[model samples]
Target: EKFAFQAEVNRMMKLIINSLYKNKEIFLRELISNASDALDKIRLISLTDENALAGNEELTVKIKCDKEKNLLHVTDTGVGMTREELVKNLGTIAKSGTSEFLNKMTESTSELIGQFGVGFYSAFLVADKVIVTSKHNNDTQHIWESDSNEFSVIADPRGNTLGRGTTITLVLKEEASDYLELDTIKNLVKKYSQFINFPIYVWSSKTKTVWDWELMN
Candidate 1:
């Protein structure tokens, strides 16, 4: 259930936290992008298997920041990850597809800054801790968490909060509190992921009545 990061990953994360400090907003863009990719996969599968959705219909990315807790959550109703995948994608194997990722990081171009292959690891650039809760069609729900130094995967104690797909809650670094602001998150999406394939929503305080999901793009 718990494991140390691969040496390559630990080294890579150290480099990322230090080197990508200024590009912290990439966390949302990359995370959202990855979520869209998962949604796309599920949609594609549904085309072949009529029951792929399994009755959960909403397929979108919803972001909510709990300023009180200083946590930013990015939730997607998409193809959820199984236990092995939670480990592989968010746990010990979250990054460093060997030297390929390192090479991409060291490249001179900034193209890879917003859209990198290592989406989950990108969270480390801005978060002190990251918790991912996910449910797969074929497997029970699970939680994967990491603090850069080490990672763990366990069956979620709270059962299925997500009907399917994933919800990643990031404990924002002290200096990154701005990311918890809805305005800041909205603008980041407008600036970086405006064309994201799936509908993206931010939990907003609209009127004196109810909570709303303000669509960004």
Candidate 2:
């Protein structure tokens, strides 16, 4: 879907951008919560059908930060979105009361993240643009992207990099760039997702010194 946000979608998005979420860091919690929900969904299906894990057996969440590139990635090995699902979940917003929209969104998908009908939009708190790459066992990989005004989706140019799952990449704002720090990510995870069912890992680095034989000689 390559349409602009409907009047209602624009209204709600403005609400989120202007008034909701007191702390910007809560975006991490909201996203992680959404990922946890997606993981729960695939696991629920696995109980009935043993083949549900055929695409990806590992149910975990991983985070990576690219300081040089100014991108933040959150990936989950769970039931991913199909082309239709991507449109349904991310392309448009529900034309209903906020409370009703929240309820319907929670019940609508096991492969999505707009839990409160606004969780996904929380990305705008820090990102100037958000790109979602998803792959479902039943469909080819696809990309969904938005800058909060309009969105577009198409078959991924990179092919099926994620065997089965979703990856959300954020082009963070300059002020929000602190999210790229490993320590910031770690602290946020500990505070909001410490008791989560899934393991959350953040990309980090440590210096390692190697011995030089020439120096010793």
Candidate 3:
């Protein structure tokens, strides 16, 4: 499967970028939810096959902010994504994200809230570039990158440091620094994912390490 996003896919992507998801802070919630889902998969697999635990037995989540780099990274050492899986999962346009605009009968009254996996596309709403690095037991380490115009998936030159997990790096826009705030994101999670069963953690520069709090602990 090719890593490139087609022209039609670009148009579809733009459509999703414009749609409001109601609560932008919910971005953290969606990311944590996805990570938790990945962890649950590994936990369940470990129950059936002891070896499935691999090297990442510690179940944890980490959200890091690099304001200097204008990058927000969400990482989970859970189930990683494969190359074929990346293309199938990400290369394909998110129909749920794009459907809202496509099916809109009138632009004046059209406002779509959420879509399946549309969370990924939401990055485009604030980011000019996105880089994803992942390592899976069944596949080699790879990097997937996109600039909204197009996307490319390729073997990572940095090798697999994640062991068995996924990392999402969002290169935010200059005007979108509001997302870089730790408190803002935490509040969003408290309102949306507080009841979730997984432990979520976010790194704070003031603490100089990962901590679990209301937003991400």
lDDT of each: 0.79, 0.76, 0.68
Supply the TM-score for candidate 3: 0.80
Give candidate 3 misplaced runs (Cα > 4 Å): 6-8, 21-23, 93-115, 205-217
Cα lDDT tens digits for candidate 3, 76-142: 8778899877776777755544445455522521223233454566667677798878888788999
> Candidate 3: how many backbone clashes?
4
Q: Is candidate 1 or candidate 2 better by TM-score?
A: 1
Clash totals for all candidate models: 0, 0, 4
> In candidate 1, which residue pairs get closer than 3 Å at backbone N, Cα or C atoms, i.e. clash?
none
Clash pairs, model 2 backbone: none
lDDT tens string, model 2, 126-202?
A: 99999999998889999999898888889998889888889999999998978988777777877877666887777
Q: Per-prediction RMSD in angstroms?
A: 2.2, 7.7, 3.8
Q: Can you give the TM-score per candidate against the true fold? A: 0.91, 0.84, 0.80
List runs of model 1 lying over 4 Å from the truth.
Answer: 92-97, 107-110, 113-116
